A paper describes a structure:
This suggests that CYB5R3 can adopt an open conformation with the two domains distanced from each other. The distance between the two lobes of the simulated open conformation was 4.0–4.7 nm, consistent with the value of the 2nd peak of the histogram obtained from the HS-AFM experiment. Remarkably, while free purified CYB5R3 exhibited a brilliant yellow color, the conjugated form was clear. Since FAD emits yellow-green fluorescence, these results indicate that FAD is released from CYB5RC by UFM1 conjugation. Thus, the conjugated form completely lost its reductase activity.
Ufmylation of CYB5R3 depends on the E3 components UFL1 and UFBP1 on the ER, and converts CYB5R3 into its inactive form. Ufmylated CYB5R3 is recognized by UFBP1 through the UFM1-interacting motif, which plays an important role in the further uyfmylation of CYB5R3.
Author numbering: 4 to 275
Amino acid sequence: STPAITLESPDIKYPLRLIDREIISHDTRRFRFALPSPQHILGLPVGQHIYLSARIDGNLVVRPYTPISSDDDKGFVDLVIKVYFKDTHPKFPAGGKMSQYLESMQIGDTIEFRGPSGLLVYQGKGKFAIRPDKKSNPIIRTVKSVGMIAGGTGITPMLQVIRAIMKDPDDHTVCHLLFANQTEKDILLRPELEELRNKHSARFKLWYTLDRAPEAWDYGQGFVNEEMIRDHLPPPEEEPLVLMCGPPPMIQYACLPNLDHVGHPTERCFVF
Ligand SMILES: Cc1cc2nc3c(=O)[nH]c(=O)nc-3n(C[C@H](O)[C@H](O)[C@H](O)COP(=O)(O)OP(=O)(O)OC[C@H]3O[C@@H](n4cnc5c(N)ncnc54)[C@H](O)[C@@H]3O)c2cc1C
């Protein structure tokens, strides 16, 4: 109520105006959108995301994104987007629908936001409120540590939580992040993650892994396995929560079964 929220109902689409573009690398962008007034906030609880929706080439396309801005930000929302260009991966000649749609927007164009959405909310100081499904009440579990597995753009739901914890000097939850990508080129938001690690090392552990690592590389190599789970996530005996977001293949065949191997109950594993 104090600051006016933009996402007043989840059943409503809000056309937000694109006000700024930023080329980060060849295929990664930051887009900024104007909230309805400069004193609005988004209205997005930690742990949840929004959907963009648009009519692209005659079809309705809906996709989830987690902003890198937060409810402290007045007047705007920022998204970091990986663009899947056509005519690039000869085996995905068409590219990605939504990300190329965003790449093509001009300053002034609008796009429809809706939310908040998602089964998990972070309540602070270790309190996670997790719905078994969209229609049931949340179960509330209090952890002292959170393990996090992210592939590609899956980092933006981790970062939102990481930040939410580090802002709060009274939040002593320890976050352990294992970040998987294809090539060093593809470590999205590396400077942000490393600045946070520089300041908050006692509450933030960070480790990468790469499918095709360069010759000078100090971190993991290959897919997520038993050993990386043991070495870079809190142990199952600490009763940690474990969060996952990334390409469905990695989550389903690389993460979940090995999490089961090591001993993390599936009740303490959550996929965004
Ligand atoms: C909780 C959550 C948060 C998310 N946060 C973000 C975020 O912050 N930023 C973000 O950018 N995305 C985010 N996403 C992902 C986003 O929802 C989309 O999956 C992504 O934008 C791709 O959508 P698209 O329509 O463009 O691609 P699609 O049309 O769905 O593309 C189909 C698929 O083909 C493959 N593909 C196509 N072209 C290429 C190519 N050139 N190279 C390689 N593979 C290719 C990719 O696997 C691609 O996803 C998030 C998803 C979830 C669930």
